[PDB]
UniProtKB/Swiss-Prot annotation, chains F, G, I, K:
Listed result of changing residue 22 to Q: In MODY10; reduces binding affinity to INSR; reduces biological activity; reduces folding properties
Top-level taxonomy: Eukaryota, Metazoa, Chordata, Craniata, Vertebrata
TM stretches of this protein: none
Range covered out of full length: 25 to 53 of 110
Organism, as annotated: Homo sapiens
Protein name, per record: Insulin B chain
Length: 28, 21, 28, 21, 21, 29, 29, 21, 29, 21, 29, 21
């Protein structure tokens, strides 16, 4: 639902921060 | 997946490291 | 550089929204 | 890459769509 | 309105486009 | 809870991205 | 210009905050 | 407009309130 | 759902904008 | 604290200012 | 320019995620 | 302080953590 959509936005932000130069793949 | 693991309870940044390349 | 870092933050958020169910890779 | 392409001139949603899986 | 429509169900970017000027 | 309020925050960011220089009004009520 | 693009994103966030139930008009011209 | 007023120097929240409905 | 975690993310952004030059303290616990 | 006050209901800007330095 | 203002918004969101339940003090000057 | 350290150059996670309580 909307909660999970909003959560995913925050996940990608966190992954961006933690992964640094490694980068990341995201999939719901 | 990541949504089930990390939207149901808080994932630490260390746990999130698992999803990095 | 800080410029690019802050740009990337916004790029990943945009990719999140554009790619939806498909997901995406970030490299930078 | 995306930073190079996307990070001085604005990339459209269409252009960004190229980076999706 | 938009909140009723899009905070109850996820609106795609295309559907959101429907609320632009 | 404040999920609807926080949904709004995300909604306007998405509107910003989609509308581009079209701009938009946001009228939450 | 990317700097202006990123500025607008932050403007919309601040408008959402300060405007509350009124909402806002984002009209970048 | 907002971009001219507020992207070149920092606008306060009170200044930004001029763009509320 | 991670209600408070996502709430906090928004709270710090709001505090950032409201507080300005004062800065703020975020002490959730 | 702020989480109890402002994650339960929406805090006004004046309420949030209690947490400024 | 507003660069530092925009940077600060990202800084606090990063501090939020890094610090977790510990929280943090943001004192920009 | 933090603005000078972390907005002049990108701070690592470690450098950020220094600022936590
Ligand atoms: O469990 C989560 C969910 C979203 C962002 C985050 O940093 C952690
Ligand atoms: O070119 C860009 C840079 C950042 C976000 C975006 O939507 C486009
Ligand atoms: O339906 C929604 C609500 C919030 C953000 C978004 O991209 C879509
Ligand atoms: O002048 C500005 C520009 C962007 C966000 C903000 O809160 C103020
Ligand atoms: O009560 C709240 C929670 C999050 C953001 C905000 O502006 C107010
Ligand atoms: O130095 C910084 C500034 C902003 C965000 C971040 O993760 C690091
Ligand atoms: Zn959110
Ligand atoms: Zn930004």
């Amino acid at each position: 639902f909307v909660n999970q959509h909003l959560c995913g936005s925050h996940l990608v932000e966190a992954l961006y921060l933690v992964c640094g130069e490694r980068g990341f793949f995201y999939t719901p | 997946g990541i949504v089930e693991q990390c939207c149901t309870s808080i994932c630490s940044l260390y746990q999130l490291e698992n999803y990095c390349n």
